[PDB]
Design an enzyme around this catalytic site. Structure first.
Site, PDB file in Angstrom:
ATOM      1  N   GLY A   2       0.800  -1.212   0.000  1.00  0.00           N
ATOM      2  CA  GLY A   2       0.000   0.000   0.000  1.00  0.00           C
ATOM      3  C   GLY A   2       0.835   1.265   0.000  1.00  0.00           C
ATOM      4  O   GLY A   2       0.459   2.262  -0.615  1.00  0.00           O
TER       5      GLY A   2
ATOM      6  N   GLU B 106     -12.251  19.523 -10.393  1.00  0.00           N
ATOM      7  CA  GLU B 106     -13.032  20.370  -9.499  1.00  0.00           C
ATOM      8  C   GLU B 106     -12.709  20.099  -8.035  1.00  0.00           C
ATOM      9  O   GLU B 106     -12.849  20.999  -7.200  1.00  0.00           O
ATOM     10  CB  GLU B 106     -14.523  20.173  -9.768  1.00  0.00           C
ATOM     11  CG  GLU B 106     -15.308  21.468  -9.883  1.00  0.00           C
ATOM     12  CD  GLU B 106     -16.798  21.243 -10.087  1.00  0.00           C
ATOM     13  OE1 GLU B 106     -17.165  20.442 -10.973  1.00  0.00           O
ATOM     14  OE2 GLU B 106     -17.601  21.864  -9.353  1.00  0.00           O
TER      15      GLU B 106
END
Ligand SMILES: Nc1nc2c(ncn2[C@@H]2O[C@H](COP(=O)(O)OP(=O)(O)OP(=O)(O)O)[C@@H](O)[C@H]2O)c(=O)[nH]1
Ligand SMILES: Nc1ncnc2c1ncn2[C@@H]1O[C@H](COP(=O)(O)OP(=O)(O)CP(=O)(O)O)[C@@H](O)[C@H]1O
Ligand SMILES: Nc1nc2c(ncn2[C@@H]2O[C@H](COP(=O)(O)OP(=O)(O)O)[C@@H](O)[C@H]2O)c(=O)[nH]1
Ligand SMILES: CCOc1ccccc1/N=C(\C)C1=C(O)C[C@H](c2ccccc2)CC1=O
Ligand SMILES: [Ca+2]
Ligand SMILES: [Ca+2]
Ligand SMILES: [Ca+2]
Ligand SMILES: [Ca+2]
Ligand SMILES: [Mg+2]
Ligand SMILES: [Mg+2]
Ligand SMILES: [Mg+2]
Lengths: 349, 424, 438, 53
Positions: free
Chosen positions: C146, C254
């Site tokens: 990870g 955005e």
């Protein structure tokens, strides 16, 4: 068994609290950097609040409220009082104060000053700072130019404040004083006023004409012992406690300490602490806080009480450590970590 | 996937290894002929970690049995579960090692070691993804000690990036076969310092004291000592062998337990040890687990500090209660954990209890107090070496005194390195 | 319509991704076999949900996702689970042997051997896109895969897709649910290497999720399945704007525009309400005012910290269910008068609000009750730096003694990368302080 | 307290409410990875040398 750590060796109050905790046999002190504690007696500066309440399975308590500095810095207290509608710019119990840098209120300060001296009103002001300890960076003057020039010499931000030109004077002596009240705020945000306070008295006659000899004007214990040759004359260590002061008010002014002064003190303590409660309460937080505060008050000759400052790390009067520090253990520590007639007045809200 | 290759060497190594395979074969439902007769597919979910599947639905231990004399392996082959082992995996000589590290490491063992590696290579090549090796042996004899560490060195040469863990029985003068055990143990410890990733230190005096004082066995035998070891080995390996919280191969486990490469000598224990049908509460299990009397290196953990700690709980019990009790022992033992490895006490639960117990707990401590064990060995070593006593047994096999001097220094450095992290 | 590709790295990333795609299918009416009866365009797209699902000629809707783990047992559960028909084999990439909770092993040793294969499988998904906007990357901070392989993938994604946004959902390490000890190392190492390559990162502290599951769901001992179902609800709230008709946060760009004025300070705090136990027989439904006020309780935050003692740079309110603008503004007005909400001087004190009328979807048989309205607040507050200070301090404790360092050097990493990464974190803590304190 | 940018569709609506106005190259990655592989190989060669002694 409970675990605590000490990170302020200079605290007289919590050296005594730590001593009491061990004498219980149910508290164990760890190294100052061991994170697996229940209680942190924290450092005065940069206490790492962000590391509290993340040790799995430990309920963690700290003896400082994060954010309480806004009440306990002189420049910060002025801003809080002027901008909080609960207190407002009209607040009747705090002297007219202005924040000055060497934002700034220098133009507004001179504005109210202009109206004051033009109207032949008393125009004495006292400029002080947070970073100035031991009563050194203080200047009392009626000339604004001298106050402002003094501020630029020192490096830190300053507060100019209306000097209470008509203080209540103890007799005999014609002498000034201030009242220190100790206030404990527990993890539930109960506000407890210690039933014992102390008056820090001046042992010199108050002299309204000359402000240059600051000894009759400044009531600090360090200053009176250092400069007043009459130190200890009227009372031991220039400290008068409530039984005597109340008896004086009864004999001289036919009133009581509770009626003439303490109602206002309780009102002021409540107003300040209720104002900042939303910003500092630990009610629904992953760690809990309590804190001991020292409120300083002035009384004028009309028996009106004025708040002077709030100390976030107060010491205590010598003959009161045992009682108050036990009260801290009872109300603030053992209430979260129980062990195997009350000295506080609960100010309700 | 995640296959382990098991090796047992010498008399102690094979007698303890055989008990280990008896214990876990019972837990996995494998009968003495390799046939599965359990009642739960949980017994088979990770059966491949330790067993190969032969056609006919037979399960065969991935086990290699090594000795320099035939006697003990003849006894294993005749033992209760003697038939489950692959016959080709019995590798033995005839001369013996005479309780002599030099014969095991340099002369007799050197002649046999290549054929052992042939079997190791054959078992490794049939592993989907070998995760490492485990060795059972004693350090006080000749085959387990000298040839065992020769094997470990040869395995590290051929498989340099495979984990190597040992269950190593440390000699004690109170449970001793010969006076040269401190020589053999000291020579072996330096091999372990360099070439194992985890070494579980099992002190024979601790095992004896547990049998005598706790189990109320008046006259303990090696068999009684070995029942403690096989039960500990079963618990230590519980989380590899059964489904549960831990999804970790040997490398991940070693990464989190070994902060410094040489300080990989572990203190194991387990609970309960009782002389019986009484239920053990979680507080009792947790309290006994951290008690020095339940640990097997004969070191007092209060004389040092824990670098890392792992505890495995077996049985149906409250996880919430386990957490609460592990926090209670940590606050009582707050001084004895290093504060510069945060959260260095870890727990894992396995729902399946061992045979005969509703619940149990196995303890794995990496504590600096293990230096007390190496100090004992070093003292006993020096008491003889200062007079060069019994050295002719070793110089006769080609060793010279310098190699003894260097083994002594290496052990005293190891002790010194433990002392430096105990004062941090 | 512009596609988004989700990448799930390591155990935490794969299991959370599995929980998210299950929920997406429930929210969009996609059955486990991939069919979607409400989609009347067979084999053809351009709808909002097509940003996350491609379509085959047989009418199955395939997640635009890649699952990668250096070890197969977690992705094998995807291969055999309920939604096994959703994914085709090429989307599921597994190695033989994991990174052993060692960043250096996931980044250097193993990552080098699998990075080109992973990029090839991602390229195959990119080729089905008419206008890829970028990537959503799920992973733990603490795992070797990870942390180590994610930072390598993020670097190569900046090379191969330079003009594409990259968002992270990162699991911050919590001792309550971890048996690892070296996670502070892996977290600082991966944050240092990923920082320049991530446009916006949503940190989820397992400690906060764990305590929410204990307090609000009455789960004494939460499991990963409990945690991931809750996390997937929050992830769904954040990605819903990309998957449904709307005008707020309709593309990945955005997210940076609305939430990240300063590139390095790109870790918004998520707060979610309400979390209600499904086992709770009688429950009174919470109002808009009540769930919005709950957005300012630290007990509902994805990371425990105190926003009263930081400053805000941006604040987004994402409602699902029965919510109208008038009640949001009434709730905001009352909260502003009662709570400490201080913005930095160079930002407007305001809230961007999005409302999706479909109430939250919950997994049948899960722990969460269905509610009539829910909200996720995304606020960029300097208070989240508390989580960096916690992590950096645990790093400092171990690294002063060089504890465990040899495992990383042994995989070919140099000791200087540790201090280089720690110094970057020191600068990051300083940046938050410059923004948030007077 | 001003509402701006109100957009409405069948699925929901969005708006803003205001209270107050105010990289390494591919070759360089390959260098890093190959440098680490070489430090691994050098450490392994020392181990094998040590075992050969
Ligand atoms: N919320 C959540 N956290 C998880 C999950 N799985 C693992 N974690 C956390 O992630 C960290 C461990 O990292 P992993 O994701 O398991 O490791 P990895 O990415 O697979 O890398 P390896 O080291 O190669 O196994 C710990 O902090 C765990 O608590 C999960 O399914 N959900
Ligand atoms: N506006 C005012 N009018 C009259 N006297 C004042 C005053 N402000 C301060 N003083 C006097 O100055 C003394 C010390 O003031 P101040 O409390 O600001 O300094 P300080 O913080 O260093 C001492 P402490 O910490 O005990 O409060 C007070 O005891 C009081 O007598
Ligand atoms: N616990 C235990 N220790 C043993 C056993 N057999 C021998 N030992 C110990 O092991 C050491 C002797 O080594 P041994 O295995 O017999 O010699 P080897 O055959 O040459 O490896 C001494 O310290 C003995 O106390 C056993 O069955 N159990
Ligand atoms: C990372 C923390 O790990 C654990 C956490 C909590 C509980 C148990 C844990 N387990 C450990 C430490 C372990 C080991 O270190 C190695 C053990 C072993 C030894 C010899 C042969 C085979 C296996 C197998 C084994 O479970
Ligand atoms: Ca011979
Ligand atoms: Ca040969
Ligand atoms: Ca379609
Ligand atoms: Ca970029
Ligand atoms: Mg003061
Ligand atoms: Mg023997
Ligand atoms: Mg993994």
């Amino acid at each position: 068994m409970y675990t605590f750590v000490v990170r302020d060796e200079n605290s007289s109050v919590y050296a005594e609290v730590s001593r009491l905790l061990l004498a219980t046999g149910q508290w164990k002190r760890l190294r100052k950097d061991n994170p697996r504690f229940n209680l942190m007696l924290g450092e005065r500066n940069r206490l790492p609040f962000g590391r509290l309440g993340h040790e799995p399975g430990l309920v963690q308590l700290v003896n400082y409220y994060r954010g309480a500095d806004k009440l306990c810095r002189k420049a910060s207290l002025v801003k809080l009082i002027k901008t909080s509608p609960e207190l407002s710019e009209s607040c009747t119990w705090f002297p007219e104060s202005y924040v000055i840098y060497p934002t700034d209120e220098r133009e507004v300060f001179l504005a109210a000053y202009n109206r004051r001296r033009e109207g032949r009103e008393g125009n004495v002001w006292i400029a002080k700072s947070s970073a100035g300890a031991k009563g050194e960076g203080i200047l009392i003057s009626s000339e604004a130019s001298e106050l402002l020039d003094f501020i630029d010499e020192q490096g830190q931000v300053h507060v100019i404040q209306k000097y209470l030109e008509k203080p209540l004077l103890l007799e005999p002596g014609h002498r000034k004083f201030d009242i220190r009240s100790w206030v404990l705020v527990d993890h539930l945000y109960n506000i407890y006023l210690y039933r014992e306070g102390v008056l820090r008295t001046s042992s010199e006659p108050y002299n309204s004409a000359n402000f240059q000899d600051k000894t009759c004007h400044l009531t600090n214990h360090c200053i009176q012992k250092e400069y007043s040759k009459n130190y200890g004359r009227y009372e031991e260590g220039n400290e008068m406690f409530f039984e005597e002061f109340n008896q004086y008010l009864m004999d001289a002014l036919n009133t009581t300490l509770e009626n003439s002064i303490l109602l206002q003190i309780k009102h002021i303590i409540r107003s300040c602490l209720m104002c900042i409660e939303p910003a500092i309460s630990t009610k629904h937080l992953h760690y809990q806080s309590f804190q001991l505060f020292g409120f300083d008050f002035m009384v004028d000759e009309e028996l009106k009480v004025w708040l002077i400052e709030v100390n976030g790390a107060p010491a205590c009067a010598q003959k009161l450590y045992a009682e108050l520090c036990q009260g801290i253990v009872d109300v603030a520590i053992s209430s979260v970590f129980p062990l195997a007639t009350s000295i506080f007045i609960k100010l309700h809200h | 996937m995640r296959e382990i290759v098991h090796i047992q060497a010498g008399q102690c190594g094979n007698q303890i290894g055989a008990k280990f395979w008896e214990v876990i074969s019972d837990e996995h439902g494998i009968d003495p002929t390799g046939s599965y007769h359990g009642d739960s597919d949980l017994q088979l979910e990770r059966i491949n970690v330790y067993y190969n599947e032969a056609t006919g639905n037979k399960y065969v231990p991935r086990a290699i049995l090594v000795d320099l004399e035939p006697g003990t392996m003849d006894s294993v082959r005749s033992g209760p579960f003697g038939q489950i082992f692959r016959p080709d995996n019995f590798v033995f000589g005839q001369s013996g090692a005479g309780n002599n590290w030099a014969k095991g490491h340099y002369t007799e063992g050197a002649e046999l070691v290549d054929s052992v590696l042939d079997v190791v290579r054959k078992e490794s090549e049939s592993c989907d993804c070998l995760q490492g090796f485990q060795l059972t042996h004693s350090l006080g004899g000749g085959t387990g000690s000298g040839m065992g560490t020769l094997l470990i060195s040869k395995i590290r040469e051929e498989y340099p990036d495979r984990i190597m863990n040992t269950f190593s029985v440390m000699p004690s003068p109170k449970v001793s076969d010969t006076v040269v055990e401190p020589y053999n143990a000291t020579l072996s410890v330096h091999q372990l310092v360099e070439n194992t990733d985890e070494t579980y230190c099992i002190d024979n005096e601790a095992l004896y004291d547990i049998c005598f004082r706790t189990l109320k066995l008046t006259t303990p035998t090696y068999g009684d000592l070995n029942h403690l070891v096989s039960a500990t080995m079963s618990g230590v390996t519980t989380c590899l062998r059964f489904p549960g919280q831990l999804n970790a191969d040997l490398r991940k486990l070693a990464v989190n337990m070994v902060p410094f490469p040489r300080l990989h000598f572990f203190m194991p224990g387990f609970a309960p040890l009782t002389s019986q049908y009484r239920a053990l509460t979680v507080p009792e299990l947790t309290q006994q687990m951290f008690d020095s009397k339940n640990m097997m290196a004969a070191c007092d953990p209060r004389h040092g500090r824990y670098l890392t700690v792992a505890a495995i709980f077996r049985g149906r019990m409250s996880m919430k209660e386990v957490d609460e009790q592990m926090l209670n022992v940590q606050n009582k033992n707050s001084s004895y954990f290093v504060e510069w490895i945060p959260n260095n006490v870890k727990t894992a639960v396995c729902d399946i209890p061992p045979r005969g117990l509703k619940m149990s707990a196995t303890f794995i401590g990496n504590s600096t107090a293990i230096q007390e064990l190496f100090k004992r060995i070093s003292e006993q070593f020096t008491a003889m070496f200062r007079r060069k006593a019994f050295l002719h047994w070793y110089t006769g096999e080609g060793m010279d005194e310098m190699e003894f001097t260097e083994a002594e220094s290496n052990m005293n450095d190891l002790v010194s390195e433990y002392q430096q992290y105990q004062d941090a | 319509m512009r596609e988004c590709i989700s990448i799930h790295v390591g155990q935490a990333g794969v299991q959370i991704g599995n929980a998210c795609w299950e929920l997406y299918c429930l929210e969009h009416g996609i059955q486990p076999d991939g069919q979607m009866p409400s989609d009347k365009t067979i084999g053809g797209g351009d709808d909002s949900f097509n940003t996350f699902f491609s379509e085959t000629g047989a009418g199955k809707h395939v997640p635009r996702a890649v699952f990668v783990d250096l070890e197969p047992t977690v992705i094998d559960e995807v291969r055999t689970g309920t939604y096994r028909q959703l994914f085709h084999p090429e989307q599921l990439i597994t190695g033989k042997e994991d990174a052993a909770n060692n960043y250096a092993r996931g980044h250097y040793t193993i990552g080098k051997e699998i990075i080109d294969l992973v990029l090839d499988r991602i390229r195959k998904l990119a080729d089905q896109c008419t206008g890829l906007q970028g990537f959503l990357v799920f992973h733990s901070f603490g795992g070797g895969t990870g942390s180590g392989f994610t930072s390598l993938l993020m670097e190569r994604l900046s090379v191969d897709y330079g003009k594409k946004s990259k968002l992270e959902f990162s699991i911050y390490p919590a001792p309550q649910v971890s048996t690892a000890v070296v996670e502070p190392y892996n977290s600082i190492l991966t944050t240092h290497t990923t920082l320049e390559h991530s446009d916006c990162a949503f940190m989820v502290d397992n400690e906060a999720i764990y305590d929410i599951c204990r307090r609000n769901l009455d789960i004494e001992r939460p499991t990963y399945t409990n945690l991931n179902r809750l996390i997937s609800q929050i992830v769904s709230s954040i990605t819903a704007s990309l998957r449904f008709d709307g005008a707020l946060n309709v593309d990945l760009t955005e997210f940076q525009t609305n939430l990240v004025p300063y590139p390095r300070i790109h870790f918004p705090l998520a707060t979610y309400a309400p979390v209600i136990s499904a086992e709770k027989a009688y429950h009174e439904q919470l109002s808009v005012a009540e769930i919005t006020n709950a957005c300012f309780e630290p007990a509902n935050q994805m990371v425990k910290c105190d926003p009263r003692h930081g400053k805000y740079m941006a604040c987004c309110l994402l409602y699902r269910g029965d919510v109208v603008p008038k009640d949001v503004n009434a709730a905001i007005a009352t909260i502003k008068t009662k709570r400490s909400i201080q913005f930095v001087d160079w930002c407007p004190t305001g809230f961007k609000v999005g409302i999706n009328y479909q109430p939250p979807t919950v997994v049948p048989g899960g722990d969460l009750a269905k509610v009539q309205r829910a909200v996720c607040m995304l606020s960029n507050t300097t208070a989240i730096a508390e989580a960096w200070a916690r992590l950096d301090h645990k790093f400092d404790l171990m690294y002063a003694k060089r504890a465990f360092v040899h495992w990383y050097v042994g995989e070919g990493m140099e000791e200087g990368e540790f201090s280089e990464a720690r110094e970057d974190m020191a600068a990051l803590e300083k940046d938050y302080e410059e923004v948030g304190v007077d | 307290m001003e509402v701006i940018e109100l957009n409405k569709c069948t699925s929901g609506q969005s708006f803003e409410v205001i209270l107050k106005p105010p990289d390494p190259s591919l070759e360089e990655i390959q260098k890093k990875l190959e440098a680490a592989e070489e430090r691994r190989k050098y450490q392994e060669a020392e181990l094998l040398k040590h075992l050969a002694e």
